[PDB]
């Protein structure tokens, strides 16, 4: 849902107020990815320990 | 094609062996050129020598 | 080249190590990216 | 750009399209200044 | 800039018909329709009718069959000739300029047109001069009496229109077949009895022009 | 474009298209002359 996908690209283009709003959602997105990861990883462990 | 006013043109040059119909081939087109035209497209016709 | 420097090249800007590679760039291909949206390689505008 | 383009008695050579059928899509022009129809009423020239 | 004011008509009797002449200035007249109305006889402002540009016109349906429109291309001049007036039919008339959505952006001036069947009279002018016990503070307060003149309008004016600070124009009073006009202005005292004071009275109808001395 | 003689009406509103150069933004940015000077998905003073 942010402007752009890449960080340089809206920190090259947007002021401070307005990067950290679209940083924000890909801060919670690419969060949420690798706790999935995570979250999937782990289980996946428990079934090959 | 017209994407957001910019009339995109693309092209591809090759030999072929055919003596019927469209022959049966797969080869991906490149860019050509890229015009921003802005004009709505509805027909269109081909020149013939 | 094959230096970590902070580079910028019409707008794709970012960390990398300038390197010549073995990739064969079409004249309309201006800059590569890999699947993560990250740039893999660049056309110089100055010296194409 | 009062001090420039207003002039005494008012400065009309900008105009704009009052209204229009449908809404223009993103950079869209139209210099056409034929009468188009308000209602069902069929003009074909003549305002009125 | 803009100009499209009315003249022409001075008395009219009723059921009877007349000619209006109304200069358009500031634009030309094959790139706006001149719209025709009137001015409150009575109820709400009306509407008469509208030359589009080089084309046909509309007409009021309670006038299309008397009111006509003679737009003078040529001349940069609008006519228009009524037929079967009634004395209802009393007020200013006015041309404006076709707008976007058949707006009428500009207004003119018009003229008081006047329907009776009483017959036309110069105005007999008589000032208000204040007697020589006349007493001032700081300023004085001076007019006329314009009685017995027939159409409307009359202007008063204080030395040819020169004070402007308290000028007040009254409305005519309806007397038998004339009207009574009065005025009120002000201006301070060392203008009179020092310097020279005249009312200036000018009848568009009758064209007269009265000076009398206050 | 900006000290133009005159512009055009908003709705023959000219596309002036921009290629093959270079220009200073501060400059506008900064020149202390514009009534309204508001960006929409980029920075003026970054886009330099």
């Known amino acids: 849902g942010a402007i752009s996908s890449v960080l340089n690209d809206i920190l090259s283009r947007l002021d401070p107020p307005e990067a950290e709003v679209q940083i924000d959602r890909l801060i919670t997105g690419r969060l949420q990815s690798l706790q999935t990861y995570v979250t999937q990883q782990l289980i996946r462990a428990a079934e090959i320990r | 094609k017209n994407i957001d006013g910019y009339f995109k043109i693309y092209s591809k040059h090759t030999p072929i062996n055919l003596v019927r119909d469209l022959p049966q081939g797969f080869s991906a087109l490149e860019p050509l050129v890229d015009l921003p035209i802005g004009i709505n497209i509805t027909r269109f016709q081909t020149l013939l020598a | 080249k094959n230096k970590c420097v902070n580079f910028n090249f019409n707008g794709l800007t970012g960390t990398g190590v300038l390197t010549e590679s073995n990739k064969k760039f079409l004249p309309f291909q201006q800059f590569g990216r890999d699947i993560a949206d990250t740039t893999d390689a660049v056309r110089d505008p100055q010296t194409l | 750009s009062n001090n420039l383009d207003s002039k005494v008695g008012g400065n009309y050579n900008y105009l704009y399209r009052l209204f229009r059928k449908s809404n223009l899509k993103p950079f869209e022009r139209d210099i056409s200044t034929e009468i188009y129809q308000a209602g069902s009423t069929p003009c074909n020239g003549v305002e009125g | 800039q803009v100009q499209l004011k009315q003249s022409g008509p001075s008395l009219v009797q009723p059921s009877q018909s007349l000619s209006i002449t109304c200069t358009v200035s500031?634009?030309?007249?094959?790139?706006?329709?001149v719209h025709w109305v009137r001015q409150s006889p009575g109820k709400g402002l009306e509407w008469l009718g509208v030359?589009?540009?080089?084309?046909?016109?509309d007409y009021n349906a309670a006038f299309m069959s008397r009111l006509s429109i003679t737009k003078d291309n040529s001349k940069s001049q609008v006519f228009f000739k009524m037929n079967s007036l009634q004395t209802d039919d009393t007020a200013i008339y006015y041309c404006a300029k076709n707008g976007g959505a058949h707006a009428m952006d500009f207004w003119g001036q018009g003229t008081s047109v006047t329907v009776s069947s009483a017959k036309t009279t110069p105005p007999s002018v008589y000032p208000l001069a204040p007697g020589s016990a006349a007493q001032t503070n700081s300023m004085v307060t001076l007019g006329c009496l314009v009685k017995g003149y027939f159409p409307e309008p009359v202007t008063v004016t204080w030395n040819s229109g020169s004070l402007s600070s308290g000028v007040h124009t009254f409305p005519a009073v309806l007397q038998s077949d004339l009207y009574t006009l009065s005025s009120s202005v002000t201006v301070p005292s060392s203008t009179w009895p020092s310097e020279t004071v005249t009312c200036n009275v000018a009848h568009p109808a009758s064209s007269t022009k009265v000076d009398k001395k206050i | 474009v900006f000290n133009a003689t005159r512009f055009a009406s908003v709705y023959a509103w000219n596309r002036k298209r921009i290629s093959n150069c270079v220009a200073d933004y501060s400059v506008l940015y900064n020149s202390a002359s514009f009534s309204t000077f508001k960006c929409y998905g980029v920075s003026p003073t970054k886009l330099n």
């Open positions: 030359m589009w540009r080089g084309g046909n016109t």
């Open positions: 500031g634009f030309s007249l094959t790139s706006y329709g």
